Amino acid sequence: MDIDPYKEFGATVELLSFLPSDFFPSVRDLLDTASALYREALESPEHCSPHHTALRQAILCWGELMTLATWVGNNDLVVNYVNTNMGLKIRQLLWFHISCLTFGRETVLEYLVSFGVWIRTPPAYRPPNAPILSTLMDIDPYKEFGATVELLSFLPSDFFPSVRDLLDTASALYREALESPEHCSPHHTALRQAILCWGELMTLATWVGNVNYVNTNMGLKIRQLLWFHISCLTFGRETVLEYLVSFGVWIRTPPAYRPPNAPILST
Amino acid sequence: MDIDPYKEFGATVELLSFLPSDFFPSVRDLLDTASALYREALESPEHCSPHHTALRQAILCWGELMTLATWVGNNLNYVNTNMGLKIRQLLWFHISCLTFGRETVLEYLVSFGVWIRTPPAYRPPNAPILSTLMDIDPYKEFGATVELLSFLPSDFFPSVRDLLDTASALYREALESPEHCSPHHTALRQAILCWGELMTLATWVGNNLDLVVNYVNTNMGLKIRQLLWFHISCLTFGRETVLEYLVSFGVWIRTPPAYRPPNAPILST
Amino acid sequence: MDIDPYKEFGATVELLSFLPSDFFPSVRDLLDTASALYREALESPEHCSPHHTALRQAILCWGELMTLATWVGNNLDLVVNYVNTNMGLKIRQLLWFHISCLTFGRETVLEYLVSFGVWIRTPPAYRPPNAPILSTLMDIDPYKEFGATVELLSFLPSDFFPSVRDLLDTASALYREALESPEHCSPHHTALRQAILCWGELMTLATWVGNVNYVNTNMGLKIRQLLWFHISCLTFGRETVLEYLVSFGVWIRTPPAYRPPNAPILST
């Protein structure tokens, strides 16, 4: 399954390769621009726009890569690797969705065409001023979906399936829905990023070998985002919101006072 | 979470500390004031006001501090300085809401609060005093008693850390609301703050002279886990369902194991 | 109480950190712009815009700070570089904002601070060499728009106003959800956010000068009058305190053994 991270928004990954690599601002310069304008709209308990759901998973995915990169620095050079291969990818996702929130949807799509002809022409007949976008923070990933990360701390560590076992569930059930140019739900917008957040993390975990604590620290965090959004699409949206409450009272009761089988999720 | 126990009444905790610290009466003058006027109403099985639900837990939380302060003095002064000022304000504000109205005391904290602030030559000569001229049960207004909650086993109720974060994962945006959504919410806002100042005293004696945290969890931590489990379940499953759960589960643990249903009764949606 | 000067008008403090420090024109070149375009409206007794109420107090905040900087130059050159780095730069923003919001409208500045954000975030090999500058659409009485004058409040004696800490605690206890809110709700709240923040800069400078107890009898008294007048305008209404000020005038002007010994207290 090959998921284009911005295909629902009108762009492609190769149309956005019109811009050079060293055109996007730094992640320090992108996260502060996000928090200066959209702070109460990013910490909001509802999804105002499909860029807002896409930007929330992009900020949190950089939080995982920075937690992973400084981990292997303890156990100097990996920061030079992460800022060239996948740190550039987060800079594309942060730049695109910030400039979609500010300067509309179609204006930044017309900007990639208007930059696509500026960089293309020879330097003799090029204007000196490149085209630029003219006149018009700890977030919770489940916050617009109703649950919190505290509510999913009641589920034990072995309740979730494997991450390879969970990509196969989404790739079989919802493949032509996740690889579509539409959204069709705010869950598919959030689910498409968690595929690539794990996909752009496993290439770092493959490169760092040339030990595997990732499957209890970062992978357990991605097995929650995969399970919550698959079950939000399969067994309804609010049925899983009331299932976690019913699992909350089961896991809180001590042994010899609860039924021995955990409550399953169905219908 | 940070819960303000005046927030649903229109007042804030910094509007109450607008006044001087020594203005509020003693706990003995305030507890016998509420017993002289509302002992026939605080012991009643109805709410009749959201101030009565807040006042029943404010008296009971002071009884929990005066069962721990007697224990830490006996098994080796601080309460009246820190915890005593916070309990004198809850008794003063809730009595004066029931006696003089809720809106008059809110315009009294503003008017008297600027009266100290003005210089003593350009202010009115006298302070503008306000005049329009006991054993209680925390479940009795809800339907249960202490006896029905003790009918269930003592180690049935979960840990205190397991119950605080359930409220923070289900009703954090409703416990910190400026509106009392239910009398279960008003009785629950006091219980988080009662355990908050109960544990705050326990860390101070832990640094002063751990036996005390083993003592609190026996007879005070168990008493907190009762109404923390009770008010969370009554918000989730309804008050008319938890009362049947205590009856259903209470008979189930008493019957012999060969003639009971094989799994314990549990509440769910 | 952490009050914010721009949060009422739409922007924030950190959103104005998009622009660098050395972008704003000097305090000399900004006051020459204000007096050239808005002098018949800044000195007018009307409430013409909430930018005018914030600009009337921002000039007099600098007019009181420069007095303190001139005063410490005698009774000890090392303070001018301080008052141009921490203050100065903090008041160059508040003067640049309300002049440019009066001139080009308020919503154009908020789309300009974003548009200078994208010009400053891009690497220098791809941004244009031209900045995205915007070009398309004297003494001030601080009480005159509200009804009173300075000399009407000189009749109240120096031992009549409470201290600044007693008058700032009255603010955060009575009006804190209305001062910190992003709405105006009155011309008094807008004039009260600046008087609190101007005291934040005076006590900051007075601390570093002592690293000076005349501040609360030459400049703190002007803050004690401004904080008293706007708290009383919200507590008792505006007409009542203006009617009380003429009733203190006929009291404090009569000699002793002809006036009642009790001052005419504010009521209602």
Author numbering:
A (entry chain D): 1 to 75, 195 to 255, 285 to 358, 375 to 431
B (entry chain L): 1 to 76, 199 to 255, 285 to 360, 372 to 431
C (entry chain E): 1 to 76, 195 to 255, 285 to 358, 375 to 431
Which sentences from the paper describe this structure?
We have developed a modified HBV core (HBcAg) VLP, termed VelcroVax, with surface expression of a SUMO-Affimer. The genetic fusion of these monomers using a sequence encoding a Gly-Ser linker ensures that the genetically fused pairs will dimerize within the assembled VLP, termed tandem HBcAg (tHBcAg). The genetic fusion of two monomers results in a tandem HBcAg construct and the introduction of an anti-SUMO Affimer into the first MIR of this tandem construct forms the basis of our VLP capture system, VelcroVax. In common with the wild-type HBcAg protein, the modified VelcroVax protein assembles as both T = 3 or T = 4 particles, composed of 90 or 120 core protein dimers, respectively.
Notably, as a result of the tandem arrangement of VelcroVax, the T = 3 configuration does not conform to icosahedral symmetry. Each VelcroVax subunit comprises two connected HBcAg monomers, only one of which is modified with an Affimer, generating an imbalance between what would be true icosahedral asymmetric units. As such, this configuration was termed T = 3* rather than T = 3, and 5-fold (C5) symmetry was imposed during image processing rather than icosahedral symmetry (I1), which was imposed for the T = 4 VLP. Freshly purified VLPs were used for cryoEM data collection, and structures were determined for both T = 4 (at 2.9-Å resolution) and T = 3* (at 3.6-Å resolution) configurations. The T = 3* reconstruction was less well resolved than the T = 4 reconstruction, likely because 5-fold symmetry was imposed during refinement to account for the unique symmetrical arrangement of T = 3* particles. Both the T = 3* and T = 4 reconstructions had clearly resolved density for residues corresponding to the helices of both HBcAg molecules within the tandem VelcroVax sequence. Unsurprisingly, given the presence of flexible linking sequences, the SUMO-Affimer, the second MIR, and the internal Gly-Ser-linker lacked clearly defined density. For both T = 4 and T = 3* VLPs, maps low-pass filtered to 10 Å revealed additional density above the four-helix bundles consistent with the expected size of the Affimer, confirming that Affimers were likely present but were not resolved to high resolution. Because of its unique symmetrical properties and therefore much more limited chance of success, focused classification was not attempted for T = 3* data.
